[PDB]
Design a protein around this ligand. Structure first.
Ligand code: A1BOI
Ligand code: ZN
Length: 140
């Protein structure tokens, strides 16, 4: 589990969104596994606006933050899970790292801020849903 709290937005994995998230919806995209809802309190996370390919992510199944090298956001094939059939997921970045289903939502960050959140995994790989292109998270 986990979310990004930026301004009056809460960014979560679409497959982990709650009823309150759907009842306060700002934007969602199944192809990216992302959903954004509105918040009453202001958040403290800042979004990175960069093309970094190195950073650090949080892994809840190890209680550890790991430094990783990750691919550029792309259209990647992801195997069937409890939440989606086997399909192409867009704006996804891959790295070598430990992940389990419940690790979704962990933040990936670089020197500029939050890059994205854990969205996929298995077999020593971890995939992150990028958020750096969502410029509207910084305003309104
Ligand atoms: C942390 O990711 C791991 C790790 C190990 C095994 C499996 C997974 C994830 C949770 C499987 N998936 C892919 C997700 C998606 N974004 O399509 C939806 C889903 O259930
Ligand atoms: Zn960066």
């Amino acid at each position: 589990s986990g979310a990004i709290y930026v301004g009056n937005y809460r960014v979560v994995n679409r497959h982990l969104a709650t009823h309150n998230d759907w009842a306060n919806l700002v934007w969602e995209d199944s192809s990216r596994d992302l959903l954004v809802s509105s918040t009453t309190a202001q958040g403290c996370d800042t979004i990175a606006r960069c093309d970094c390919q190195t950073g650090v992510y949080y892994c809840s199944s190890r209680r550890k933050h790991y430094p990783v090298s990750f691919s550029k956001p792309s259209l990647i094939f992801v195997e069937a899970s409890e939440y989606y059939p086997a399909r192409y997921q867009s704006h996804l970045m891959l790295a070598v790292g430990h992940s389990e289903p419940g690790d979704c939502g962990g933040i990936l960050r670089c020197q500029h801020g939050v890059v994205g959140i854990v969205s996929t995994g298995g077999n020593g790989l971890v995939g992150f849903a990028d958020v750096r292109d969502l410029l509207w998270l910084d305003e309104e």
